[PDB]
Structure 1
């Protein structure tokens, strides 16, 4: 018989292989479509979730009650030190798919990149790419590399570049760099190949590809939560207190005549650590990392045109469970998937951005730097010392 009262189902059937993610680094399933009219550029980057803070900004939406009004919005900080290009990969179209054609690496590979090639770096002899680099310093090897580049230019239609992060500049415990293919979109195949070859063994800052007030995509893995019940995994209704054999369950698993439980029935299992791809994340501010000309330059992280202070994005005592942000960082509106120290993949929008919200210009007015390790109440140590005055430990 039909159910007495209709109700929408719990959860989405389009998201339910609910398995612990096989990969840790976020994966770009589909790069932006390539058109041979715009200049060459990258479409992906790797960052690390540092923390979250406030923002103050005037709204510029006519007709809204919030027009020309200051608002407080949550923003997340993603530290993005520059990446190093180490190789390129070519692809050829096939009626079966798109298989890789040829991969060429650079003569010099950093130890951080070589960390990824070994499961046990301590026990390893660090022999990776020992014979490969002999090609770059020999006439026969140079001729072979020239032939490889010519073949990729003649046959390949999709070109991707291998780049790795600089884990030395991060405060994280791990030292193994993250290596990812980044697709180069731009002019013809030859132009993209030559541009990628020029960028070999070179650092690519994040500001080259991403700009201010731009909608991007964030790709990463969700926070892991282990084995969870159906009440928490699928947000089903709880049975009343009188229930004998447990109330944090689903009462009717299925019907009789189909003598199986369908795949659409909510059940207990792994919750969290799922690969996700969010869309329409707006870049409020692209920050400049610590640099030294005479002394330290820390103002640019958290100084605005209205504050003009020497603050940094790091709160008092630093970011909780992450550390201190020293390199370049990207400020995204709202929240992103993953926990602290989680590597996040920044991807360009796959859609044309023509909207009032998408084209809105962002002008920061104030950045909150109060300590997140408790109920902070002072922006800087100087303000705290001025308010409190001298203490016993002086």
Structure 2
């Protein structure tokens, strides 16, 4: 027979390969589209989730009951040190897809970027890029690399840039820096590649990528929770107390003739550690790190034009399970995906 009382589905059918994430760093699946009218710029950045706090601000939309009032807001601090550009990569449009064409790394690659190429930095002999760095101070090697740049300028349609984080200025335990392709969207391919060549072996701060009061996207891996039950996983109804084999289970899977258990039937398994992209998070403030002109400047982080104190965004005793933020940061309205010390795009 049919179902007596109609009910919506527990769980989403779009999010159900619920496997543990094969990647740890939040990967961009879709960069914004480019048009040759705006100047060249980065479209993504990579920072680490520090913590959470309040924000008291002035509400300025008409028509609401909360017009010209004060609210509190749950925000995320994301410590975003300026990254280092150590390479570029070109892409060509094929009828089978969007294929990479040529990857040109930089001459002087830092040891934090070199840690990524090794699974064991201790037992390694640190021999990466040793015959590739010799292709810069000679005439024939620089000529072949310039011919490769010219071939990329002629044939490539999509240009991404290779940038890695700085693990020296962070309170985390690890030293292996995260590398990332960031698609440069802007003018023509020649001016784009010339700007990327200019920004090679350089620092990219946050203000060159994002600005004030911008609605951005957060990409990251969920805080892992382990092999959870179907009640904790799919939020199904608990069976009553009088059950014999269990009350935190799914009672009926399905019918006899085929409704053998499908992708749509809720089961127990992995909860958490899932790749997630959540859109429309507002940047309240892009902070400024600790800089020295005579002594330390701790004021410019958390002192507003209404507070006029000498506070930084570091709490009393620092951030819980993260460390102490000494670098420039961003502060996003809402909550972002991932636990503390989590890499976040």
After TM superposition, what 4+ stretches of structure 1 lie above 3 angstroms from structure 2?
none
Classify the secondary structure of the residue corresponding to 2:46.
strand
Asked if the contact 1:216–1:280 (Cα under 8 Å) also holds between the matched residues in 2, the reply is yes
CA-CA distance at 1:209 after TM superposition: 1.3
Asked if the contact 1:10–1:236 (Cα under 8 Å) also holds between the matched residues in 2, the reply is yes
Q: Deviations over 1:303-340 (max 9, x none)?
A: 00011111000000000000100001000001000000
Gaps spanning 5+ residues in structure 2: where? none
Q: Deviations over 1:117-141 (max 9, x none)?
A: 0000000000000000111011110
Asked if the contact 2:215–2:282 (Cα under 8 Å) also holds between the matched residues in 1, the reply is yes
Q: Deviations over 1:188-244 (max 9, x none)?
A: 000000000011110000111100100000100000000000000000000000001
Decide whether aligned partners of structure 1 residues 32 and 259 sit closer, same or farther in structure 2, where only a CA change above 3 A counts. Answer: closer
Asked if the contact 1:89–1:160 (Cα under 8 Å) also holds between the matched residues in 2, the reply is yes
2:325 aligns with 325
Alpha-carbon distance between aligned partners in 2 of 1:186 and 1:260, rounded to the nearest angstrom: 52
How many residues end up aligned between the 2 structures?
345
Asked if the contact 1:51–1:76 (Cα under 8 Å) also holds between the matched residues in 2, the reply is yes
CA-CA distance at 1:263 after TM superposition: 1.3
CA-CA distance at 1:254 after TM superposition: 1.2
**Over the residues paired in the alignment, what is the CA RMSD in angstroms?**
0.6
Asked if the contact 1:91–1:98 (Cα under 8 Å) also holds between the matched residues in 2, the reply is yes
Classify the secondary structure of the residue corresponding to 1:13.
coil
Classify the secondary structure of the residue corresponding to 2:148.
helix
Q: Deviations over 1:153-183 (max 9, x none)?
A: 0000000000000011000000000000000
Alpha-carbon distance between aligned partners in 1 of 2:326 and 2:159, rounded to the nearest angstrom: 32
CA-CA distance at 1:261 after TM superposition: 1.1
Asked if the contact 2:16–2:263 (Cα under 8 Å) also holds between the matched residues in 1, the reply is no
Alpha-carbon distance between aligned partners in 2 of 1:38 and 1:286, rounded to the nearest angstrom: 23
Q: How does 1:1-394 map to 2 (within 5 A)?
A: 1-258=1-258, 260-345=260-345
Q: Deviations over 1:26-82 (max 9, x none)?
A: 000010001111000000100000000001111011010000001111111000000
CA-CA distance at 1:259 after TM superposition: 6.0
- TM-score under structure 1 length normalisation: 0.87
Alpha-carbon distance between aligned partners in 1 of 2:272 and 2:70, rounded to the nearest angstrom: 36
Alpha-carbon distance between aligned partners in 2 of 1:183 and 1:253, rounded to the nearest angstrom: 45
Alpha-carbon distance between aligned partners in 2 of 1:214 and 1:72, rounded to the nearest angstrom: 19
Gaps spanning 5+ residues in structure 1: where? 346-394
Alpha-carbon distance between aligned partners in 1 of 2:271 and 2:179, rounded to the nearest angstrom: 27
Asked if the contact 1:254–1:262 (Cα under 8 Å) also holds between the matched residues in 2, the reply is no
Alpha-carbon distance between aligned partners in 2 of 1:219 and 1:146, rounded to the nearest angstrom: 35
Asked if the contact 1:290–1:298 (Cα under 8 Å) also holds between the matched residues in 2, the reply is yes
1:384 aligns with none
Alpha-carbon distance between aligned partners in 2 of 1:157 and 1:263, rounded to the nearest angstrom: 39
